[PDB]
Amino acid sequence: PRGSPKVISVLNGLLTGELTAADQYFVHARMLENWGFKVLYERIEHERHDELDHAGLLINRILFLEGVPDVASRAALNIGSDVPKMMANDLAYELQVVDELKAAIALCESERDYDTRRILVHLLEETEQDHVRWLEVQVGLIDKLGLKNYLQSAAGEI
Amino acid sequence: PRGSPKVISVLNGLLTGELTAADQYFVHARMLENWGFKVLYERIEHERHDELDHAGLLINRILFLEGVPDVASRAALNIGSDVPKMMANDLAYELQVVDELKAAIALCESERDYDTRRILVHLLEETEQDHVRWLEVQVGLIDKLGLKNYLQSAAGEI
Amino acid sequence: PRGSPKVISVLNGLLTGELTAADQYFVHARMLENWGFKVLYERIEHERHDELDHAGLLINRILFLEGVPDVASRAALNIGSDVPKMMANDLAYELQVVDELKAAIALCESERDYDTRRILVHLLEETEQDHVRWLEVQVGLIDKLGLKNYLQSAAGEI
Amino acid sequence: XXXXXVXXXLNXXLXXXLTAXXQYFXHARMXXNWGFXXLXXXXXXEXXXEXXXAXXLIXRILXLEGXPXXXXXXXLXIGXXVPXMXXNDXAXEXXXXXXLXXXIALCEXXXDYXXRXXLXXXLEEXEXXXXXXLXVXXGXXDXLXXKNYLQSXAXXX
Amino acid sequence: XXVXXXLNXXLXXXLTAXXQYFXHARMXXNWGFXXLXXXXXXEXXXEXXXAXXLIXRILXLEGXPXXXXXXXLXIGXXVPXMXXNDXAXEXXXXXXLXXXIALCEXXXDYXXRXXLXXXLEEXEXXXXXXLXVXXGXXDXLXXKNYLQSXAXXX
Amino acid sequence: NRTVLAALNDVLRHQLTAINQYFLHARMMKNWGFNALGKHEYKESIEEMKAADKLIERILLLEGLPNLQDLGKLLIGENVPEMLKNDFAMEKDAHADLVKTIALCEKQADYVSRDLLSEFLEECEERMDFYETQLELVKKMGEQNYLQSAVGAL
Amino acid sequence: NRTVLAALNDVLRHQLTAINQYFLHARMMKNWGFNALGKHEYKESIEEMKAADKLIERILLLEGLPNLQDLGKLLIGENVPEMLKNDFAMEKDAHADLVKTIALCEKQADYVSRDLLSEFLEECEERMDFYETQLELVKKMGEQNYLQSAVGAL
Ligand code: HEM
Ligand SMILES: [Fe+3]
Ligand SMILES: [Fe+3]
Incomplete structure (x- = not known):
């Protein structure tokens, strides 16, 4: 079943964004482990x-x-x-992913391509809840708890 | 735990090779499952x-x-x-990875950096005896069973 | 919970399509069992x-x-x-059903029948993933494995 | 004390078994290298069985106050391809069976009956668990076709 | 090609070791020394496993395993004799292994180097060690006491 | 070889000094109520003690007598971060000597000793990374927060 | 009290020397194939280890500094009976110093220190009785029989 060329193009852009975010999270998780922030x-x-x-x-x-x-x-x-800095960068990338995902969902809806719209809606829900919400919460916690308290909560059991 | 700059550069080259191998394996696995070759x-x-x-x-x-x-x-x-073509490309990439890994192991031995040499020997063992030999077996099986029988075995249950 | 007459009409058309699909799948299952293709x-x-x-x-x-x-x-x-021939007929009918489902989803979005839109989107997801994808994969496997190997796979254990 | 002739025949049978075991091992690892995991597992089982047989033979030779010759080994007819390996294995096993029949006759003649019981057990093992399987494999390589037989031998991928 | 030749040499060594260990184990079991018999049978099994690993490694290197060429079996007549012969064979094998590991390092083949290092660990710290121990024990205990310990339950 | 056994004995002396320092530091950590860091120090002492056991096996296998009499200068910290720095310094010196000994074992073709020392080096390097990470955590979380974390269960 | 702390440091030094001597002796016994005796001395070293740990905790609670750096002379014997004799002699010296220290702790009203040292003395005299019994068994059963008993399994 051939899809719209524009739909495939925006899906490829979404895939590029998702792979870049996966690699960035890879690096950030490894530097967090190296620093000792296990949680x-x-x-x-x-x-x-x-x-x-x-x-x-x-x-x-x-x-x-x-x-x-x-x-x-x-x-x-x-x-x-x-x-x-990594929390802010993750939040910024997640927000850009949200914007591009909304654009792609609108395009899929305009193209009568509804299964891909369902997958993109699931991706957008996962991004808003698991990623954007958590990262904005983390930024707020750094602001409230302070730097040292947040780093202590992040290091876990030493 | 300061590392040598040549060792760091060779490790970055190996890591880039492994990330590209992961991407290629991801694409190949997804197209294999798209074609119905479950195994x-x-x-x-x-x-x-x-x-x-x-x-x-x-x-x-x-x-x-x-x-x-x-x-x-x-x-x-x-x-x-x-x-x-998938098998040929993966086997060629894995052979190139093996050659670069052997060069890196020689460099690590030369620089008296033994922990990285240990990690790279583990990586070489894994690449040769779980990736290279499996792909070589797969190409040999394509040659022996023929194309259609190998594809039948790859499709598994339908 | 009165619905638009157009929505009920397209729901009846979709119901006719699914009932005909059930009849065709029934006959095809019995014929496959008769021929010995247990899988x-x-x-x-x-x-x-x-x-x-x-x-x-x-x-x-x-x-x-x-x-x-x-x-x-x-x-x-x-x-x-x-x-x-049965695989091709099933694939053609499921593609037709996909066209009808997309038209009905567009209508339901136009008519603000959002729960009907949700059930039809679930229907389209099922049709495109479980049915259309499997039949297309089977056609590809008939092309790749050959006819004799595909029939041997479809027979299963004897 | 066992007879000179009986101990000699048993040492011969032992050499046969040792060569068989080595050949089976080489073939099984070659098949594993080629990816035919099912046939490899089968041949490994056969090699283990041959090892057990050789051990029984060694024990028997030792009980008769004779010295086992585990340094002598016959030529290893090794095949380059699966049907070649199968044919080679069949040939070797048939030779071993003939030798075993002769040995059983000698043991019966020399009034050695425990040795003959051991030899008869080994004969059933070599004609059933081995020669039969190999003959069947050759027949199936001819019936299924080499391609289908190799696909079956690869088992899972 | 030199690596393949060295691996084949080590394979011949391991096959000979297995063939000698098995004979010694069955003679020791024939004599009634059940404990020593069990130990030597386990040793033979381990040697068979190691030889199999060697065969697999040679095959993965596009080679032909010489599983027909075997060396001289030094068989003993008494338990001390078998112990000494086994120790001698193992020492020679360890020397050969060291040479082979050096060659593998020089020839930049690190996988076979790792396999050979594992084989060397198994030889030195599990076979040569045990046999050296037993050789010392047959002297510290006396022949009679050692044979009684070897006979297990009589 | 005399030099290989001498280097092994130096590694053993470093390991025994590490054992004593680790156990002493764990004991004064428990004495101060720093339970989490005290337990981690205790397990590091246990790991170093098992490693010294393995090295004593290796030295005795090489027909060489271990030197458990000597002990390097102990580096005892007045407070938890000072103990972290002293541990890091001791591990740095031990790791440099370990690398030298691994190279020497390669020169003399004592590959089993080299493998054991490589395993010991892996342990030493993970310990070094842990102590550097702990010191950076002291810098980042602060002394009060890090000590509260080191307390663990009150 | 300073005198109690000094006596505790001396007893701890005997503890550390005993730990090292027992571990070395057990490792030599294992190297010679004496599994039962070697395992017994390994357990004995672990008991000594726990006793030293308790002594370090006690010394720390008294606001003293446990001197883990210094060690005594190690009496390492070349054979099993001489190793038993050296262990017995070390235990005798440690027991005499322990009795003097218990008397000092009673004089200085340090009663928990006295209880800990009394537990140490009970264990030390248990070890002394075991080693004297082993020497008597060496005499009675003979060296060959005793070494066979020490070997255990094969
Ligand atoms: C010198 C002061 C030492 C102290 C205070 C000490 C303390 C301890 C303690 C508390 C244990 C735990 C016992 C158990 O869990 O059963 C232990 C076990 C052990 N120690 Fe010692 N030890 C010392 C020296 C040594 C030395 C020098 C070695 C080796 C060269 C060593 C090797 C071991 C081993 C192998 C164990 C057993 C580990 C286990 O059970 O997982 N120790 N030690
Ligand atoms: Fe890799
Ligand atoms: Fe087929």
Whole structure:
């Protein structure tokens, strides 16, 4: 079942974004583990696995629509120097992912391509809840608890 | 735990190779499952997970050596149009990875950095005896059973 | 819970489509069992039961909307004489059903019948993933494995 | 004390078994290398069985106050392909069976009956668990076709 | 090619070791020394496993395992004799293994190097060690006491 | 080889000094109520003690007599971060000597000793990373927060 | 009290020397194949280890500094009977110093220290009785029989 060329194009853009986010979460989780912030490490590891599953779902949808996934192309990685910086970078990338996902969902709706709209809506719900909500909560917790208290909560049991 | 700069650069090259291998394995597994080759899809997906673990080990070693990893840079993806081309591309990439790993192991031995040499020997063992030999077996089986019988075995149950 | 007459009409058309699909899948399952293709017969019987569940949901939705289900009508059955012909006929009918479902989803979104839109989107998801994808994969496997190997796979254990 | 002739025949049978075991091992690992996991597992089982047989033979030779010759080994007819391996295995096993029949006759003649019981057990094992399977495999390689037989031998991928 | 030749040499060594260990074990079991027999049978099994690993490694290197070429079996007549012969064979094998590991390192083949290092660990710290121990014990305990310990339950 | 056994004995002396320092530090950590860090120090002492056991096995297998008499200068910290720094310094020196000994074992072709020392080096490097991470955590979380974490269960 | 702390440090030094001597002796016994005796001395070293740990905790609670750096002379014997003799002699010296320290703790009204040292003395005299019994058994059964008993399994 051939899909719209525009639908495949925006799906490929979504896949590029998801793979870039997966790689950024990979780097951030590994630097968190290196620093000793174990709780943040596990959370970002689960977030990276979620991004990998999202990318897999996008690839399956693209292959179903007889497209060719653009898995070679990647976006610029924003790697933060310290924990607040990586949290802010993750939140910024998640918000950009939200914007592009809304645009892609609108395009899929205009193209009468409703199964892909369902997958993209599920991806948008996962991104808003598991990623944007958690990261904005983390930023607020850094603001409230303070830097040292948040880092202590992130380090877990030493 | 300061690492050598040549060792860090060779580790970054190996990590880029492993990330590109993971991407190629992801695409190949997804197209194999799209075509209905379930057995091959499961095997290549396990291989992709193993390559993700390899990249994790390499990133952790790079970070422990106080060097920044390289995850934005990605090598060229060779994607086949059918199962034998998939096997040929994966086998060629794995052989190239093995050659680079042996060069890196020689460098690590030369620089008296033995923990990275241990990690790289583990990675070489895994690549040769779980990736290279399996792909060689697959190409031999395509030659022996023929194309149609091998595809029948790859499809598994329908 | 009065629904638009157009919505009830398109629901009746979809119900006719799913009932005809159930009849065709029933005949095809029996013919596959007669020919000895136990694997294909089991899959086609599962598809027929799923389509019966689909028709059940459609009838419940029509009755809830205070509309009369049109369960008497049945479209033409396309019966093949061999496994490839039955696969092609099933794929063609499921693609037709996909067209009808997309038109009905567009209408329901136009008519603000959002719960009907949700059940129809679930129907379209089931049809595109469980049915259309499997039949397309089977056609590809007939092309790749050959006819004899595909029939050997469909026979199963003897 | 066992007879000189009986101990000699038993050492011969032992050499046969040892060569068979080595050949079976080489073939099983070759098949594993090629990816034919099912046939590899079967041949490994056969090699283990041959090892057990050789051990029984060694024990028997030792009980008769004779010295086992576990240094001598016959030529290893190794096949380059699966049907070749099967044919080679069948040939070797047939030779071993002939030798065993002769040995059983000698043991019966020399009034050695426990040795003959051991030899008869080994003969049933070599004609049933081995020669029969190999003959069947050759027949199936001819009936199924080499391609289908190899696909069956690969088992799962 | 040198690596393949070295691996084949080590394979011949391991096959000979297995063939000698088995004979010694069955002689020791024939004599009634059940404990020593069990130990040597386990040793033979381990040697068979190691030789199999060697065969698999040679095959993965596109080679032909010489599973027909075997070396001289030094069989003993008394338990001390078998112990000493086994120790000698194992020492020679360890020397050969060290040479082979050095060659594998020089030839940049690290997988076979790792396999050979594992084999060397199994040889030195599990076979040569045990036999050296037993050789010392047959002297510290006396021949009679050691044979009684070897006979297990009589 | 005399030099290989001498280097093994130096590694053993470093390991025994590490054992004593780790156990002493764990004991004064429990004395201060720093339970989490005290338990981690206790397990590190246990790991170093098992490693010294393995090295004593290796030295005795090489027909060499272990030197358990000598002990390097102990680095005892007045407070938890000072103990972290002293642990890191001791592990740095032990790791440098370990790397030198691994290289020497490669020169003399004592590959089993080299493998054991490589395993010990893996342990030493993970310990070094842990202590560097702990010191960075002291810097980032602050002394009060880090000590509260080190307390664990009150 | 300073005198109690000094006596506790001396007893701890004997504890550490005993730990090292017992571990070395057990490792040599295992190297010679004496599994039963070697395992017994390994358990004995672990008991000594726990006793030293308790002594360090006690010394820390008294606001003293446990001197884990210093060690005594190690009496390492070349054979099993001489190793038993050296262990017995070390235990005798430790018991005499322990009795003196218990008397000092009673004089200085340090009663929990006295209770801990009394537990140590009970265990030490249990070890002394065991080693004297082992020496008597060496004499009675003979060295060959005793070494066979020490070997255990094969
Ligand atoms: C010198 C002061 C030492 C102290 C205070 C000490 C303390 C301890 C303690 C408390 C244990 C736990 C006992 C148990 O859980 O059963 C232990 C076990 C052990 N120690 Fe010692 N030890 C010392 C020296 C040594 C040395 C020098 C070695 C080796 C060269 C060593 C090797 C071991 C081993 C192998 C164990 C057993 C570990 C286990 O059961 O998992 N120790 N030690
Ligand atoms: Fe890799
Ligand atoms: Fe077939």
